[PDB]
Amino acid sequence: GNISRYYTHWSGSLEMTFMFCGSFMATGKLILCYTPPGGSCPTTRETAML
Amino acid sequence: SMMEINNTESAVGMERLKVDISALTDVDQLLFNIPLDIQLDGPLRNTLVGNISRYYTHWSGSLEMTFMFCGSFMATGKLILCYTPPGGSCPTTRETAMLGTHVVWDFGLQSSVTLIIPWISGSHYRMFNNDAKSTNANVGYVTCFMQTNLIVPSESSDTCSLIGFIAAKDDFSLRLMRDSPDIGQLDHLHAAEAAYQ
Amino acid sequence: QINFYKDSYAASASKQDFSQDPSKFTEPVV
Amino acid sequence: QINFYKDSYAASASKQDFSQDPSKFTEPVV
Amino acid sequence: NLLETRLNV
Amino acid sequence: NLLETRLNV
Amino acid sequence: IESIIKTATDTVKSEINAELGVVPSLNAVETGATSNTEPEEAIQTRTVINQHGVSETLVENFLSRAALVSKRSFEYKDHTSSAAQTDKNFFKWTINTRSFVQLRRKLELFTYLRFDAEITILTTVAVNGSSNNTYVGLPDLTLQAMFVPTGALTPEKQDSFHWQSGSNASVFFKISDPPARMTIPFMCINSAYSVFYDGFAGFEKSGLYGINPADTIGNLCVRIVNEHQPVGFTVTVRVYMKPKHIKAWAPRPPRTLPYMSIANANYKGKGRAPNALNAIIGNRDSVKTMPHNIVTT
Amino acid sequence: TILTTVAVNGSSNNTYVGLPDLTLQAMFVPTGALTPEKQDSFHWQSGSNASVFFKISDPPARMTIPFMCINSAYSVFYDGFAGFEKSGLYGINPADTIGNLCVRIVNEHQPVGFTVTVR
Amino acid sequence: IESIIKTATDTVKSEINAELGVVPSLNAVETGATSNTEPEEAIQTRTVINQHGVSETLVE
Amino acid sequence: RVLQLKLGNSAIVTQEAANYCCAYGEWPNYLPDHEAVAIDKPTQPETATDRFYTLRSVKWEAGSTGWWWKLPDALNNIGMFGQNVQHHYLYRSGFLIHVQCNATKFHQGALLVVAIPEHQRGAHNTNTSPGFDDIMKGEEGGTFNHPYVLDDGTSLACATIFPHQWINLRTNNSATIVLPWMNAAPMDFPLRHNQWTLAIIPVVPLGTRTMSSMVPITVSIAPMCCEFNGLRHAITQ
Amino acid sequence: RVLQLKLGNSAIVTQEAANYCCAYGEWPNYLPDHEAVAIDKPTQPETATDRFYTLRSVKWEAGSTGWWWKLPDALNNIGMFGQNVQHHYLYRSGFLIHVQCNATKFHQGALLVVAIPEHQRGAHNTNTSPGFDDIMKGEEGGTFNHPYVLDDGTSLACATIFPHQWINLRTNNSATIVLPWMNAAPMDFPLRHNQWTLAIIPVVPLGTRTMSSMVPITVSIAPMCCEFNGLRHAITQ
């Protein structure tokens, strides 16, 4: 973010990485979605998973 | 060239160029010390190395000090000459000063001895600020002590003299030229108008 | 280095003589 | 590129070193 | 000044 | 003047 | 023995010594030679490869810098009522290196010098500030500088027929130009200039000591070429000299006491140290006092 | 690169009059060394210091200063005290200070005042 | 490992994956290394020849 | 995951590591003859100085902001390393840093462990620079005032540009970092400049619902390739 | 007759020596692997410890009996040698000893300078053994009670069987002796056993009819090939 704001045009892929910081005995599953542009941000799992 | 070690209020003209020594009744005593900062005013300033260095701003390399004994042939003694790298106060006792770089000198048929001041610096060059206590400028200290005593017979002079000399070695270098602080004027000189007549 | 003048004394400075002999001042003895 | 000065530090900018190694910041592990 | 000497007045 | 002739007036 | 030197000398690693008949730290100052003791002989050293250059202390670099040698101010006006001593729209100057102390001390480090001289002339103007005058703008005047040999005839007035310059070199320049520039060759009757001269340059006993006219380069005669305007101005001319193509012989003890005169080496010194006649270095309380001693707390 | 501009002083005694083409001197002086005390000082003789002389009607003045540090690089940040005693400022190393510029107008003053700005 | 880089990197075509013992989208942030997961390992890609220059971000 | 470190008369074992970090991909070494400046033969003590020293432990509390130590300052009075520092004008070394913290499978929390080169601190809400006693803490170290801006007006979020590891209590119980010499000069005066700052910051706070116990954090540091020049009488801080 | 000695950052010159003595014809060295006992890697400080240290000078008086110092005891609190001694269980070294005394061509006198291995002292006119404070003098050294029997019931006349030189004031102004490691074991605990004793004894007393001056005697000692084993926390005497 900081380096890109010295420039005006950009291109290429990004990566997001997440770390879980609960206890060893904690369990769960999550779904992470990226939605290409065109309308409103999705509010439901069955919309976002497309 | 000669160091002005005796830069004191009571020493007049040529007297400033020699150090007098005499017999002592206590062991291990301090004789004199010399500040080493070759940019500043002090015993080193009016020398061939001092005068040329003050046209520049940065310097590097080793120095040598040489001392000549000028007592009678019948006079005897031993001295210790020490160089202390920087970090704190100048040493006041022989058992402190002997932990640094040093030479022990015996008076004899050879009249003179050399102390090398080796280049020991964190940076490639030292730098002429107008601040003697800077980590980029300070060189440390030279000190002289009795190793034995000055011992002479009754027909010799009871007081004898040293002349001290300094020069650079061929590892020495200078850079960043400037107007010298050793000369200046507030007016035109006498007869300067005659060049326009 | 650019010099179109006819007299050689017109030229720019000469900064390339690295020769030395300190011994004529430091060791003038037999 | 035009430079008639005698000291090399007088020259124009140097825009031609394309060498990289991201791994000294992205992968500093055994 | 402080940029030449690192001392405050 | 003295620089041209080395005589004083 | 002569050799080519481009960097400071390297250091070699060294070991313990204990050896009868060998004493490299002892010397004989009475011979007049400098001590030949090396660092490797005085202490244990490491190996060091030294890349420090030595070119900024070359004699050509040390002396070849443009330095101020003359500054003259005069009034540009109708001079009909001026006194006999006034510079009436022109002046004479004899070229010398004796008048401004930074160049004088540097040249006096040597006994003999051979060089060509590059001359640069800078001009500035201002409106005369007496209470009759408002500001009006500044004129772009033409000036003439004529070279005249040492002791030869010079112009007597601004409009003299001597300014026709039939064999003398003249340079004409405007205030709106870059500064004027030209080179004067090494002109001495000898193979080098004498910086110091221990003699009397005449067959009779009567004249000045220590000045040899063979070392005086020449004269510049300078005028404004324009006629006077209805209002007065003050014009200032500055001359700079740069030595080039230099050879130098027999180095000397530097000047310590202030200069008194352009004509001689006469001396007096400051009233108190430093640079007083009886004390060159500033005082300390005793030979045991360390003047900038570090205090730790 | 050094850029200079001028304007007539705007106090109620003054009309506009045009602008002078002044000469300026900029002298390089090393960190902590002696600097001039007045406009007409004998220190401006510049016998070994570099000086540049330039006019307001010229293009801006330009020159290059070399990498001058006593170390192999400048320190942008410095976690220390650059003196053997405990007393001075944190975080400033004078070895990273390049030097001084000393700047004057070379002309004598005119009968009327002006304001000069140097960038 | 040092190399000469004048343009942004190309993309290679990729297929379906289903493979035991292999999980290129999982990482260990605690080591202090940045994630090495590539686009070809996360989605099906096409081939792309990338001609975008990198000279305007040179330190000089 | 499993590691043993052995220097001089000292050894450390861990059963829950996460590889280890070599700062900028570089390893400690002695000063070569083509980079050297001081001409005296150096002191090289080997196993007398190049060994693990362990500092006082600190307690991880619910309200903790984080902790810091400056090098070489934190070691300048410890063992034969401290004695060689006090008798010489010049010093040079690398370091190997090992940070230790354990808890149960029912605890949670995460520490950033980071080595910062030339960490020049700022003061909060004043024009006056930090004093000598704000900076020179010795063996005890200090605490962060505003860890979110690293006490220098920058940010914690971008601190991952420096050499670092994490301790995440469900994953690992230790962090290890190897540091080369890092300075503009080949050697330095050890009593006035610090090359590196170790910082430990609790980005996710300690938590559990099991039995309460005191949870310490412990730091062990080994100098590597030590050299000293300019021998004289002793000076302390 | 002329000699220069150079170790670490220290040098000594003399213009009036009388050769020098190597004890039993042997020179100092490090402990080889076929003679070693302790298995830890040793500390070898080189130029930090292997350099000249100078002690307090003593005055030569008309009634003087002579002077002595014990090694390593006289150096156990000096510089980086003293710091390495305080932090390690085991020590080993040789020594180079230089003794200095000058006077005029009108003075007369002679000193025996002798190095005694295992100089176990006796007390005079009692059955009780010497106490800890009779033996352990440190840097100041001691004086002889009965130099004619070496304070041990033997004799001064036969002391020439040990490594020695003389200072005879008409001939020379210095004496020099080189000492190897001399013990039944390869290393020792430095705070409880002394390998060597330096003794200086005025066999012909100082005399002149010229002007009276104070005539000091000065001792400089350099450790050689120092090694230390069994690193831990500091213990002093």
Ligand SMILES: *[C@@H]1O[C@H](CO[C@@H]2O[C@@H](C)[C@@H](O)[C@@H](O)[C@@H]2O)[C@@H](O[C@@H]2O[C@H](CO)[C@@H](O[C@@H]3O[C@H](CO[C@H]4O[C@H](CO)[C@@H](O)[C@H](O)[C@@H]4O)[C@@H](O)[C@H](O[C@H]4O[C@H](CO)[C@@H](O)[C@H](O)[C@@H]4O)[C@@H]3O)[C@H](O)[C@H]2NC(C)=O)[C@H](O)[C@H]1NC(C)=O
């Ligand atoms: C370099 O040194 C500077 C001088 O330091 C002082 O003088 C030397 C000789 C020693 O005695 C030293 O110990 C002194 O500190 C130093 O500048 C000084 O910096 C301080 C701290 O920032 C300034 O204090 C603040 O002052 C204002 C009030 O300012 C007015 O009054 C002063 C005279 O008292 C005038 O000089 C000013 O022009 C103003 O008219 C306070 O409001 C402020 O905070 C207080 O009030 C707030 C609420 O508003 C509270 O929250 C705070 O707790 C405070 O109670 C500070 O007290 C000090 O004014 C300033 N002095 C001068 C003469 O400039 C400088 O910082 C040093 N430089 C560096 C780089 O370190």
Ligand SMILES: *[C@@H]1O[C@H](CO[C@@H]2O[C@@H](C)[C@@H](O)[C@@H](O)[C@@H]2O)[C@@H](O[C@@H]2O[C@H](CO)[C@@H](O[C@@H]3O[C@H](CO[C@H]4O[C@H](CO)[C@@H](O)[C@H](O)[C@@H]4O)[C@@H](O)[C@H](O[C@H]4O[C@H](CO)[C@@H](O)[C@H](O)[C@@H]4O)[C@@H]3O)[C@H](O)[C@H]2NC(C)=O)[C@H](O)[C@H]1NC(C)=O
């Ligand atoms: C081992 O320790 C032995 C015991 O030491 C004493 O007891 C211990 C528990 C501590 O309190 C300790 O501090 C004590 O010293 C030690 O034996 C002792 O050694 C001393 C010194 O040689 C003896 O002193 C001499 O004693 C005689 C007198 O002897 C008669 O009286 C005693 C009782 O007081 C009886 O035990 C004897 O049998 C005799 O009947 C003195 O004449 C002599 O000299 C004094 O007189 C002369 C002139 O004649 C003067 O010039 C002197 O200055 C003196 O004033 C001593 O004072 C002591 O008797 C002896 N005690 C015993 C019980 O044996 C032993 O030496 C130690 N061993 C070693 C190897 O060190």
Ligand code: NA
């Ligand atoms: Na300075």
Ligand code: NA
């Ligand atoms: Na070289």
Ligand code: NA
């Ligand atoms: Na002279």
Ligand code: NA
């Ligand atoms: Na590409």
